[PDB]
Structure 1
Amino acid sequence: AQWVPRVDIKEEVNHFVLYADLPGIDPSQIEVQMDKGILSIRGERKSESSTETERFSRIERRYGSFHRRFALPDSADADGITAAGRNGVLEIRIPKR
């Protein structure tokens, strides 16, 4: 958690969805799990700005490790999670029990 990616969360009738803006990270390097109700989204984003940093005239993009945690309702079925990314948005879908 040296940066805190934005995550929206919705509870539909029969599932939750979390949508995490994680640009610049392959969805396979993002770990999504639920442990005792806590949905965590964790990984480490690398950034070009850590390489030849002095050649940057601006560095706005955050990166490094992240670890987002959400205490989702007990209805979230922790054995149902899927996560798939497109264009740096990770969409995590979790059925309700």
Structure 2
Amino acid sequence: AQWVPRVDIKEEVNHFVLYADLPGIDPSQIEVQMDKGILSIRGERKSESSTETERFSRIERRYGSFHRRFALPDSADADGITAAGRNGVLEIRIPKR
């Protein structure tokens, strides 16, 4: 964790949903993991603000490795996580056990 991408977490009747704003990362670069109830969203954003940095007149965008963790409830079925990204939003869907 060197940036904290924004994650919304919703608990529905029969599932959770996490919406993670991860722009600039290929959804295949983002590890969604659950380990003993902890849901981790881990990866790295390379920002072209690292390449040729003197050239940047304004840098608001954060990047680096990230590791969001949420202690989800026990009703979260870590076997059911699906994870899909569109337009830099990663949506993680977790059924309740």
TM range (shorter): over 0.9
Deviation at 1:33, TM superposition (A): 0.6
> In the alignment, which residue of structure 2 is the partner of 1:2?
2
CA distance in structure 1 between the aligned counterparts of 2:64 and 2:86, rounded to whole angstroms: 20
Per the TM alignment, residue 80 of structure 1 is displaced from its structure 2 partner at its CA by: 0.2
Aligned length: 97
Structure 1 residue 68, shift from structure 2 partner: 0.2
3-state SS in 1 of match to 2:49: helix
Alpha-carbon distance in 1 for matches of 2:8, 2:59: 25
Partner of 1:87: 87
- Structure 1 position 28, deviation (Å): 0.5
Match of 1:24 in 2: 24
Report the CA distance between 1:96 and its aligned residue: 0.3
Structure 2 unaligned regions, length at least 5: none
Percent identity over paired residues: 100
* Aligned-pair CA distance for 1:5: 0.6
Partner of 1:56: 56
Question: Shift of residue 66 of structure 1?
Answer: 0.1
- Helix, strand or coil: the match of 2:83? strand
Q: Which runs of 5+ in 1 are unaligned?
A: none
